[model samples]
Target: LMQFTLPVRLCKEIELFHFDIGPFENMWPGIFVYMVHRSCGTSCFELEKLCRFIMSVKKNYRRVPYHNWKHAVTVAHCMYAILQNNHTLFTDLERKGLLIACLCHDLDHRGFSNSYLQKFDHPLAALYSTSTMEQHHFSQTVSILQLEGHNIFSTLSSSEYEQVLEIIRKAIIATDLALYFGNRKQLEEMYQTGSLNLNNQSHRDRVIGLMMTACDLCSVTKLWPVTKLTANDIYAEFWAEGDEMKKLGIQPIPMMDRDKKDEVPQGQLGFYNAVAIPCYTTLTQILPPTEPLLKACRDNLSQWEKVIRGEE
Candidate 1:
């Protein structure tokens, strides 16, 4: 039993579909705490515990330029908004799973990709055969839950607890971009057959996985300037890794090169085309409810394309 501080400020934004959420301190924490209460109906004490748990999770995150607490909170809020928009689409547990998984999916990220871990023979590479970071994030999630007073799911029935945790595990792994593309292909085939139904258990899980991926990359679905800020924020981490690569006598990818800053608008434009658009548009095919996400991405892509054409 804990207190629930209803953030009138954050609630005001959610009322208006305000996705930008300018800065972390301004919106995310209260937004997240309020959403968790709405989804699960936690008791006052449990709600207090959940807020404490969130702060602990934030503590564990590294001070990276990106892939840090703000990114995690933003993704979590995106998934919350998605669920809010289609509340009837999922059971209470499913909504909780999506929100919790998105919040914890990138926990303890080192501002580097799985590719980086494997390339440098980082110790974490040997820790997992594949899906290195995803696995690590899940492990960290387990660690956080074990922390004193952080057991937010302690009130669930054993089965309910297990099922929710399972969704979290599945959802976290789905955030991997490589697996995301693979999943997009699977979703694409089923969507083409008009057989993709979230009402079906197996089919529902697949859709949930896609939703996890969508939330992970949801910045592309935001307004242009905010999305551009995210693009540059991520590239800051990329360039940091590029510097690391140089010390190891390897060349960095063009997207990671500081000298290629001018090409950022284009490089990210390519991502919008190849990955972001496909991730949204393909899912839109099956879950037409997701069409707005596709529309937002297209809007941002148009703006970025204008940059390449020197029109922005």
Candidate 2:
């Protein structure tokens, strides 16, 4: 229903952006739009609408330390690389849905965790008793898409549009760490039993959910330098929230407490063992293409160990 234009200069820029999934702060929105076009093609997608939608999505993200536009684009880039390496693993629609969902997964995050919302009686907490932040994220994604000149999927047929939207919803919601734990257990069981059927839709959905979490925390799966910088930003946000809680006379956990700064290494190691390592482990099991991610994650874990032992 709309035009799909790709200027020559922008095309070259998009190609170069794919060379490395590292930082390109202002180019993120353009990269996102390029990824969408690459995944689903320009046939049914409107170039201007997609551009506006991505711009809006970027604008809507709060200027938080970690869960900002950069984080969103980074996650999306991880998914794009994943899709590139495993063409047979996902359907065309699934690939498109996954990438789009990743880009919009953390929209409008208030720089606070779900528990923070519940404790503070935030409206989003009241709106969703479970997956509070995730639900709000999806809501904001829909809000942008509904805006005029923003419905990039406008040309899709009703049924296809409905399917893609549902896929996006499920993908976004699965990013919740609370939800990931349950899905992780199921995935582990499937792997251990040697019963993970790639041909099965339900099984694939769980795997997709696993990938979302993997990419969401993929910062740990980067080079030590990159991960170190990202870790600082992550702690900055957490400690800010901790400071807030302290002002309200509530004791924050060790991971969140700025006063416990020395324990950062230990906390990172604990998180890797608890969530990050296992997530990537299963991912590599199902898709060998992601072996590098698992390796980097383990390397980062060792680095954290060294930090705790004063060997760094």
Candidate 3:
């Protein structure tokens, strides 16, 4: 709605993780417009109407403690940074789908984990056979696109349109952390063995899936102040989830449990080593340009470890 219509100047000024997203009223249009231009180019559609559709999509995002529109655009911003730096690695179309997928990955999140969804007869559990939230997000993105002018894919050929949707579908669903363990093992082996090739569509698809996982947790790969802020937001959501579970007579995991709140840094230390480290390490191997992301995660992990050791 504002000067975000000017893509380059707006994005350069607003920056990426370094800048606050500020008010969604200002940034939502800025982000969606930038995404469309970077991926689809200018005048591909009616920019004003397209931005309106994006604002509508933003409204649909539930006001949960963490998984809100602000978080959605932050993840999208990381994808924006990755595409800007390594645009040569992915096809223009792949960058488009991947970026949009990041923006929609956590759509309608309930601040509850999949385990929480499956434990009770949550309607979403019945709706999807697996990966409930991820599936809903993909569905929602498609449904939103069906709105007049929102389908930025309108400029594509029939095949290109279908392919873009497929990538968005796969990329969004891949953000489920439940799938990461297996994908991590498979992707790491490929990276270490020199068998991974971006030219192979199957290999490329697998790598894209892993990229979604890494960028979804992009906070771990940020500076310590940013990482600390992100962790606080996440644990706020986690504790809210714990409150939800207690009402249903279910026990939250230690990380989610408010009673164990004091142990959060200890728990996050384990999460960094066990999950973030391995994911980003493999990412660095695949996209050597992403070495900084891995290094940042290591630095943040050291920060937490020191806190645990009373070294601060």
Model 1 C-alpha lDDT versus the unseen true structure? 0.80
lDDT tens per residue, model 3, 1-312: 333354565657444433445454565657666665765566555666677666766887888767888778877777776676676787767876877788788877878887788877799999996999899999899888898768777878999889989999999988988898899899888887888777888888888888888878887876678788888889998888888888889888888898997798889888988889999888878877767778888898999988888896
RMSD of 1: 2.2
TM-score, per-candidate, Cα-based: 0.92, 0.91, 0.91
Off by over 4 Å in 1: 1-9, 15-18, 24-27, 42-45
Stretches of candidate 2 above 4 Å error? 1-24
Q: How many clashes show up per model?
A: 5, 0, 0
Could you list the CA RMSD of all candidates, in the order they appear? Answer: 2.2, 3.3, 2.6
**Largest TM-score belongs to which candidate?**
1
User: Model 1 misses residue 163 by how many Å?
Assistant: 0.9
TM match of model 2 to true structure: 0.91
Q: Which numbered prediction scores highest in lDDT against the true structure?
A: 2
CA deviation > 4 Å runs, candidate 3: 1-25, 43-45
Evaluation by lDDT, superior candidate among 1 and 3 = 1
Per-residue C-alpha lDDT of model 2 across residues 177-263, encoded as one tens digit per residue = 999989999999999899999888789889999999988998887768878989999999999889878877889888889989988
lDDT score, candidate 3, position 184: 88
Clash pairs detected, candidate 1: 1-44, 1-45, 1-46, 2-44, 2-45
Which scores higher on lDDT, 2 or 3?
2
Better of 1 and 3 by TM-score: 1
